[PDB]
A paper describes a structure:
Derivatives of 2 are therefore potential drug candidates or lead structures for drug discovery, and we have previously reported that MZ29 (3) is a strong ABCG2 inhibitor in vitro. The structure containing MZ29 (3) is based on a previously published data set that has been reprocessed to higher resolution using improved cryo-EM data analysis software. For MZ29-bound ABCG2, we achieved an overall resolution of 2.56 Å, which is significantly higher than our previously published structure. All four structures revealed an inward-open conformation of ABCG2 with two copies of the inhibitors bound to the binding cavity. The two copies of Ko143 (2), MZ29 (3), and AZ99 (7) in all three cases form a “triangular wedge”, occupying almost the entire cavity volume. MZ29 (3) forms two hydrogen bonds with ABCG2, one between the side chain hydroxyl of T435 and the oxygen atom of the cyclopentyloxy substituent at the C-9 position, and another between N436 and the NH group of the indole ring. To visualize these changes, we superimposed the structures by using one TMD (termed ‘reference’) as an anchor and observing the structural differences to the other TMD. This revealed a very good match between the TMDs of ABCG2 bound to Ko143 (2), MZ29 (3), and AZ99 (7), consistent with the similar binding poses of these inhibitors. Relative to MZ82 (6), the calculated binding affinity of Ko143 (2) is 0.25 kcal/mol higher; for AZ99 (7), it is 2.40 kcal/mol higher; and for MZ29 (3), it is 5.30 kcal/mol higher. Our structural findings are in line with the functional observations that MZ29 (3) is the most potent and MZ82 (6) is the least potent inhibitor of ABCG2.
ABCG2, also known as the breast cancer resistance protein (BCRP),1 is a clinically relevant ATP-binding cassette (ABC) transporter that limits the cellular penetration of toxins and drugs, thereby promoting physiological detoxification and contributing to multidrug resistance (MDR) in cancer cells. It is constitutively expressed in membranes of numerous tissues and tissue barriers, including the liver, the kidney, or the blood-brain barrier. Structural studies by cryo-EM have revealed the architecture and ligand binding pocket of ABCG2.11−14 The transporter is a homodimer, with each half consisting of a transmembrane domain (TMD) and a cytoplasmic nucleotide binding domain (NBD). In an inward-open conformation, two TMDs form a slit-like substrate binding cavity. When inhibitors bind, they occupy more space in the cavity and act as a “wedge”, preventing the TMDs from closing and the transporter from proceeding with substrate extrusion.
Numbering used by the authors:
A (entry chain D), B (entry chain F): 2 to 119
C (entry chain B), D (entry chain A): 35 to 46, 61 to 301, 328 to 354, 369 to 654
E (entry chain E), F (entry chain C): 1 to 107
The structure:
Amino acid sequence: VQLQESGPGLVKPSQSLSLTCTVTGFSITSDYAWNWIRQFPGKKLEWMGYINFDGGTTYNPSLRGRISITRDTSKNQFFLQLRSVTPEDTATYYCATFYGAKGTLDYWGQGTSVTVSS
Amino acid sequence: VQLQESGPGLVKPSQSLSLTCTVTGFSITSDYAWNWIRQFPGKKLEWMGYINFDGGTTYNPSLRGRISITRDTSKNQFFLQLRSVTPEDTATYYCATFYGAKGTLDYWGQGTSVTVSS
Amino acid sequence: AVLSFHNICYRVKEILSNINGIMKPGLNAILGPTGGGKSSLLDVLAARKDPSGLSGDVLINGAPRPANFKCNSGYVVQDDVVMGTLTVRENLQFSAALRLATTMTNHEKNERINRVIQELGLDKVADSKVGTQFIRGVSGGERKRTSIGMELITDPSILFLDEPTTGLDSSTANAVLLLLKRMSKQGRTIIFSIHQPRYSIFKLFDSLTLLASGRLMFHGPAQEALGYFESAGYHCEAYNNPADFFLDIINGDLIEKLAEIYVNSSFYKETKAELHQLSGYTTSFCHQLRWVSKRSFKNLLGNPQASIAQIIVTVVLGLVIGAIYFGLKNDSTGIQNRAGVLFFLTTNQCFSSVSAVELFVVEKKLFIHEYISGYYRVSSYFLGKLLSDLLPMRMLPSIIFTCIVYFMLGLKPKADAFFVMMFTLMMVAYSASSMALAIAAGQSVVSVATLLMTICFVFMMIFSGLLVNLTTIASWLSWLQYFSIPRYGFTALQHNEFLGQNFCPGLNATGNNPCNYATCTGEEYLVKQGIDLSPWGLWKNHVALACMIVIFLTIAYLKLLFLKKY
Amino acid sequence: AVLSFHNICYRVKEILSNINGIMKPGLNAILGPTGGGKSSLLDVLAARKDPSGLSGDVLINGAPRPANFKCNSGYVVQDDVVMGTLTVRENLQFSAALRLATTMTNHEKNERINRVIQELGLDKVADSKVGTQFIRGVSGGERKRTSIGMELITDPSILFLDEPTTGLDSSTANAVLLLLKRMSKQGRTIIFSIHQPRYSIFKLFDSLTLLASGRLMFHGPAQEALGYFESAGYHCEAYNNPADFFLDIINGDLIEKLAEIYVNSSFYKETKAELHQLSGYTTSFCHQLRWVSKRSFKNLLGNPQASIAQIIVTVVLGLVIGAIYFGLKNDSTGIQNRAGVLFFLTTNQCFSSVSAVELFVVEKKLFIHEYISGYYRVSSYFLGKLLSDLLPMRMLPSIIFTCIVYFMLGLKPKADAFFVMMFTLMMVAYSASSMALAIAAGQSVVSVATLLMTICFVFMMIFSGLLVNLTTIASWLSWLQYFSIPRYGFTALQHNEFLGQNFCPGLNATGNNPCNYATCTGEEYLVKQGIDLSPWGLWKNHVALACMIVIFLTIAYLKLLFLKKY
Amino acid sequence: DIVLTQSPSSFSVSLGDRVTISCKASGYILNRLAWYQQKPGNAPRLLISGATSLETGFPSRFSGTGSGKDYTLSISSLQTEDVGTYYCQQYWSTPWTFGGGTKLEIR
Amino acid sequence: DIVLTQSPSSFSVSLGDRVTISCKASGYILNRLAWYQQKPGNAPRLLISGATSLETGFPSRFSGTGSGKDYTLSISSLQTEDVGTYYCQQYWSTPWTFGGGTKLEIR
Ligand SMILES: CC(C)C[C@H]1c2[nH]c3cc(OC4CCCC4)ccc3c2C[C@H]2C(=O)N[C@@H](CCC(=O)OC(C)(C)C)C(=O)N21
Ligand SMILES: CC(C)C[C@H]1c2[nH]c3cc(OC4CCCC4)ccc3c2C[C@H]2C(=O)N[C@@H](CCC(=O)OC(C)(C)C)C(=O)N21
Ligand SMILES: *[C@@H]1O[C@H](CO)[C@@H](O[C@@H]2O[C@H](CO)[C@@H](O)[C@H](O)[C@H]2NC(C)=O)[C@H](O)[C@H]1NC(C)=O
Ligand SMILES: *[C@@H]1O[C@H](CO)[C@@H](O[C@@H]2O[C@H](CO)[C@@H](O)[C@H](O)[C@H]2NC(C)=O)[C@H](O)[C@H]1NC(C)=O
Ligand SMILES: CC(C)CCC[C@@H](C)[C@H]1CC[C@H]2[C@@H]3CC=C4C[C@@H](O)CC[C@]4(C)[C@H]3CC[C@]12C
Ligand SMILES: CC(C)CCC[C@@H](C)[C@H]1CC[C@H]2[C@@H]3CC=C4C[C@@H](O)CC[C@]4(C)[C@H]3CC[C@]12C
Ligand SMILES: CC(C)CCC[C@@H](C)[C@H]1CC[C@H]2[C@@H]3CC=C4C[C@@H](O)CC[C@]4(C)[C@H]3CC[C@]12C
Ligand SMILES: CC(C)CCC[C@@H](C)[C@H]1CC[C@H]2[C@@H]3CC=C4C[C@@H](O)CC[C@]4(C)[C@H]3CC[C@]12C
Ligand SMILES: CC(C)CCC[C@@H](C)[C@H]1CC[C@H]2[C@@H]3CC=C4C[C@@H](O)CC[C@]4(C)[C@H]3CC[C@]12C
Ligand SMILES: CC(C)CCC[C@@H](C)[C@H]1CC[C@H]2[C@@H]3CC=C4C[C@@H](O)CC[C@]4(C)[C@H]3CC[C@]12C
Ligand SMILES: CC(C)CCC[C@@H](C)[C@H]1CC[C@H]2[C@@H]3CC=C4C[C@@H](O)CC[C@]4(C)[C@H]3CC[C@]12C
Ligand SMILES: CC(C)CCC[C@@H](C)[C@H]1CC[C@H]2[C@@H]3CC=C4C[C@@H](O)CC[C@]4(C)[C@H]3CC[C@]12C
Ligand SMILES: CC(C)CCC[C@@H](C)[C@H]1CC[C@H]2[C@@H]3CC=C4C[C@@H](O)CC[C@]4(C)[C@H]3CC[C@]12C
Ligand SMILES: CC(C)CCC[C@@H](C)[C@H]1CC[C@H]2[C@@H]3CC=C4C[C@@H](O)CC[C@]4(C)[C@H]3CC[C@]12C
């Protein structure tokens, strides 16, 4: 219902990327699924994956073993960790909400820019 | 959306009962299912059957071969015919609407009384 | 006719070392133990073995055996190859239709058959069935005379017999050999191989060829073998059968001890002198196919139990299925019941098409015998057997099943849906049967073929689309679904059934989807299973089944063409 | 010993008309055609026929045959009943364990076996396997001597032989009968029935009993039959076997013509005079069960092909199933994949338990022989065969299947769910096997039993809950679901798997149902199929499977108890 | 089918009081439960659907809680516009069945 | 997977004009189609769901019509608050894919 990304805006290649999304106004263990999306320069949207309200997870197959999504219900957060980073995945990263009964991404975050350079 | 029963309020035993429900504000061929219910004296509700938006029909098994439900889309009506009537089914008959996606009887008619005597 | 064999050496390892002799008109017996070349020399002499292993020369009246030999000579097999479901006249008619020339008339062929029936003594049984499991038939003594009559139709000059008495009783065998001897008096050269005869048999032979371990222990007149062994250093006591006496010698009461004695004998000298005195298709494709089809259909009508029972089972099963699934509803259980009944129908066609293993396996020996003898080609026999047995008995269950269950269940009430279901069921039956033929063509034991068919069908069933969703299998493994006959059958049936259906009462899903996970329409169910919604998504399955039929019937024909006939 | 039969009339229709004679120490042969009472008189004399049909009296040294007769007499069967997977010493050990007294020592039993091995001449093969399909074994001539040794363990005074030479070769049979004759010199009464012997055999007999069409054509010394027939108006020429001469007489080269001549003969008078001169369990239940179990397990280890192959197949299949269903998801396809894999597992157990038809069918003849001979009871044999074969080879596939697929598929990761699945698979295997036994106990052909098992399993599969929804069947027909082993197996597996599962990602169905037709939780799927959500809805299936096991194993034991042993 | 049983065929309460109505089903219903309120002279009116959800047009005094086979309707701080008969209905299986009904009174 | 293709990678229109955006899928989607509008500097915003339904918070000028594999977004009588990029997204299969996007211009 109200999402907010946060994390390092600059990352060394082939190390890791870690973002945090904190949810206010809703319990991430209550209903929905909690997704990460990235928009490339030269706008192109790519869904990365989600973590379900019960802790189950599902990822885009185009990110083979590089992505993990975890959560922390004690303060209502979910985290994106994208490992072994290249300069190609320098996108804008969003966290979004997926109702399921409706099927669409209803609530989005503000989006945070991540630049992979050296 | 708006239902209205009509028909004979008194019937000779073992002949037939025919009621009409005319729907205003919605097309009976558009979405829902269209049901008949009867409430006995000494209040007891009994679902009789429905006709679907595509013409399919389903009846209560406690009315074996005695009931038929038809429709007339030219003026948005559906009809209940209960044949070989006895003095036991002297109830109040309602037409109701069943959404399906929700599961409940949402809109009802005013209800018409039918007395089986001689 | 005089059949002379000179320095015959068949090798497969060797089976015949060095065999010489001559057989003139009369009764020529080839005796010895079971290991020796008793049944090997008979096939070498009858051109029923591969000439690749042959070394010596076999001659007839001074001229080598022509390519027209096996058609002009009769060869009677040990066990029966007579159709027990035809009659004694019908077997001979089928034989005369393909072994005689088309120039002749049916009146002439019928007179040949009448003369042959009379000479054998088969008048009072000429119109009785030879006999099968279900059908009571003639005694085993007149089945042999029937099998002899199917070779005298062409009236040969040389008649070979593979153990004419093994299996018969004593009083039967005696009459059979007295018949053979009366035949040998008209001027036919009769050459057989007996297994341990009795003296009432041995007293009829006119020439004896004793073989042991592929070595020639004796060859000459059959009445002089006793004296030969008496003067070779052996004595036979009273009340001892000479044919028993010989095998008692061969057993040990040494093989090179008897072979050298015979090589140094006077008989060997006379034989070598006599052997250095001298040397020093029929019919059209359509005729053969027609007669093969006629015989296979008489055999299918005359065997009602195994053909009627498949119809009874098809009706009973169809009425049970129509009673369990009576009145399919368009509600929460309609998808499950429709999918389940269609899956059962397709997999039932596949598993009921296992009896096609029996098509070419049960009559493999008769096929080999009649192909060698020049009855027909592999092509016409194959086509006639496909046309008479596989075609009419795989079409009928599909028709019966559809006609019974389609209106009890209440499937899509259109004429084209009804006929597409019928044709799809027909195609899956034909495809499973062609696969069974390709697997079992050329074999001789049903058990392994049946087991392999069941294993393959069990795997094809997993990839058919009900037990596992085919869109979820891994890419390195998903390609196996294209090898599933049940998959094409089931996909066509589902496409034909589910197209215009609703399954959520009170909800107009076809317009829009209220809630994302309802599966309220047949299009949603079909796409969720990976099925194509276009009309090509229906007939793609039928072209894949037709291609499977063609490939499997070509494999079955190439397995019959390259089968060893020797 | 002297076995005397007087005015014997066995009736089933009659098979033996009136037979009289006596057999003293020596070699007593019973000859004749196959129809006559050649094999009937042997069973009457050996107490191996029902005394209900018997009329006359059979006597031993003046005293009637005691109830202890068949235990003190040896009877060798025509075909082999030796365990081809044991060794020549092991068969005799199993025989001495159950045919000798428990008072004796193992040292005494071993000396009995050594003396018996020495007397037969089985020293160099005493520790070689008799031989089966997969195992190379001794020649067929020494298997017969092994079968003869399993009867001399108790050292009887009367030894009956049903055709000791039928199937053997000439040189084998001669040595076998010379062994029998050397035995008959020590003082044993040997009584056999030969099929058309040779003179080297006929010259050993000490008394001849010729039967034809249940009529006594001759009885007396075997050397005087020639003169008897010579003076009855017949002549035998030179080089003719007398045993052939007799059956040539019986065939017709009349039955009352030979029966009256023998009744008016001097032999008949002497026999009637001699017959009017005179007349005028072993072991404990546990011992038998232990030894039956030991032999059946040696037989199961010695036959690795048909026991290892079921393990190979269980592993291969389990790895293929684990590759196709790898990583079950909790999404729109999770219900279909879980239900499909559980259905395949249950029905695979049911169809792989069809080889249990072979348990009591393959060794029916050996069981009948050893039960008559007083080896064990039906109860101990039944229990030992169940304990050694059915128990260890039906438990192991379930364990292997569960251990392989449970973690590749990613099923419910609890220890109790894992073990409940293992136990359910075990129970469905045991129940299907008990049904197969109940169907095939007492029969002798596998084909009909296998067909009936498959038909029953095919019907039980329709009522298992996947192909048709069990809540939708008509009431006059729904009661058949309680006769389905796959139904109880599948219901227990589904109850165990689906309980705490969600199947719609992003939707908290467990709290509330947003839209009425989503089927988002495993409880909804279970209730929609008609399954009970309580723990009794799980174990009700296991108690129904245990009751089925007990009923079917009681039917199989009552079918073995009431089987005809005669 | 599925028979729905309401034990208190009748009640008796006063204003401001709390009342609880029970419904028991003979089979698992999985929250496919609805509550209707009928006044004398009118057709039934849907009050609760999904055994927990409340219909728009009713105060936040009615509440539904149930699981399995036991469902309840709680009317806390009842008023006089609340008196009537209350029916539970299952819409899980196709022959939809109602409960016997429970009439409220006023002391 | 399912690739979504928008042919007009760019457009050009004026106010009051009618514009139509096309989306084509490589597989059957069954109205599991959504339209998002993105302004420069903001996250995407859901405009249409179910390929026909319109989201609350948007005028009745946007409309969706499609079936099978061809879906369209019609903006009749466009204003200046409508310029941006438009994405189609399928939510039928688990790897959800977006369209390439179509940027609107103003003449
Ligand atoms: C009678 C019929 C049931 C037997 C038929 C057959 N259907 C099957 C369907 C199967 O699907 C599975 C269960 C539902 C989905 C998956 C599995 C197995 C079978 C079998 C067995 C098969 C067989 O073993 N043999 C033939 C012909 C033999 C026969 O019974 O025909 C006579 C005339 C009675 C002898 C057969 O017909 N089936
Ligand atoms: C290997 C296995 C597949 C064969 C097994 C078996 N599973 C079945 C499962 C079936 O489900 C249907 C399809 C999915 C749902 C319904 C149907 C039929 C089968 C069969 C056939 C059966 C059989 O005919 N025989 C035995 C043992 C013979 C054997 O193959 O064992 C050796 C060691 C290889 C010889 C068997 O094991 N099956
Ligand atoms: C389901 O709703 C669809 C609309 O989404 C109905 O179909 C339309 O009906 C109107 C009025 O009859 C027609 O003018 C349209 O041409 C129809 N559109 C389509 C796409 O068919 C439909 O009637 C409803 N289903 C049923 C069975 O009535
Ligand atoms: C699904 O929703 C249920 C109920 O709507 C959630 O369970 C409730 O959680 C709250 C707070 O965590 C507890 O106080 C309640 O007692 C729970 N009620 C029940 C009936 O269990 C549940 O958390 C949601 N599902 C998941 C997986 O979290
Ligand atoms: C509706 C179903 C049963 C169609 C079955 C077609 C069957 C019955 C047809 C197809 C080919 C036909 C055979 C073709 C050739 C011949 C040779 C003819 O001289 C005698 C009949 C006979 C043997 C026909 C008998 C009937 C036959 C076998
Ligand atoms: C009696 C048996 C042999 C019939 C099986 C062959 C028939 C049914 C096959 C062969 C060609 C097929 C037809 C091809 C053309 C059409 C017309 C179309 O509008 C629907 C499909 C339909 C109707 C098919 C129905 C099935 C079909 C008619
Ligand atoms: C879905 C998948 C797993 C099903 C299995 C398909 C494969 C293994 C099956 C389908 C058709 C089968 C073949 C059918 C015909 C032949 C030709 C013959 O020369 C021997 C058997 C053989 C070669 C079979 C081998 C196994 C086979 C190729
Ligand atoms: C011995 C056997 C396995 C030979 C091979 C048979 C199978 C694998 C071959 C023969 C005919 C082929 C089919 C012919 C036509 C089509 C339609 C096409 O749009 C998809 C592929 C498909 C469906 C082919 C799949 C592979 C196929 C089924
Ligand atoms: C149309 C679809 C269903 C496939 C039809 C398959 C049939 C027509 C094919 C498959 C195998 C083929 C046979 C294989 C090869 C030969 C050898 C030739 O000398 C005579 C024809 C003959 C015997 C063929 C006849 C046609 C045949 C039977
Ligand atoms: C884990 C699985 C394989 C359990 C299987 C149990 C099997 C292997 C056990 C159960 C009963 C056991 C038999 C019970 C009785 C005897 C008699 C004993 O004097 C020798 C061993 C022998 C023959 C045992 C062999 C092994 C046996 C057959
Ligand atoms: C190794 C093989 C033979 C084991 C088969 C028998 C075992 C698995 C059976 C017998 C008794 C059964 C257990 C009885 C009690 C419990 C504890 C409970 O919290 C869940 C069920 C569970 C866990 C059962 C699991 C299955 C079970 C353990
Ligand atoms: C769900 C329904 C349709 C499954 C079929 C149930 C019936 C037909 C099955 C289940 C158990 C089976 C029985 C198992 C045991 C025996 C005893 C034996 O002497 C003959 C077979 C016989 C008599 C079987 C007959 C068929 C049988 C009764
Ligand atoms: C010869 C065979 C078929 C005899 C009959 C076996 C079957 C039908 C009998 C034996 C054991 C019985 C089961 C024993 C226990 C229960 C639990 C009860 O809550 C439901 C009935 C049920 C499930 C019985 C059903 C009928 C049953 C399965
Ligand atoms: C507990 C569940 C799995 C059922 C167990 C079935 C077993 C224990 C039952 C079924 C059949 C029974 C046999 C049937 C009758 C007899 C006759 C008696 O003189 C000796 C025991 C014996 C041979 C029984 C032993 C126990 C037995 C094998």
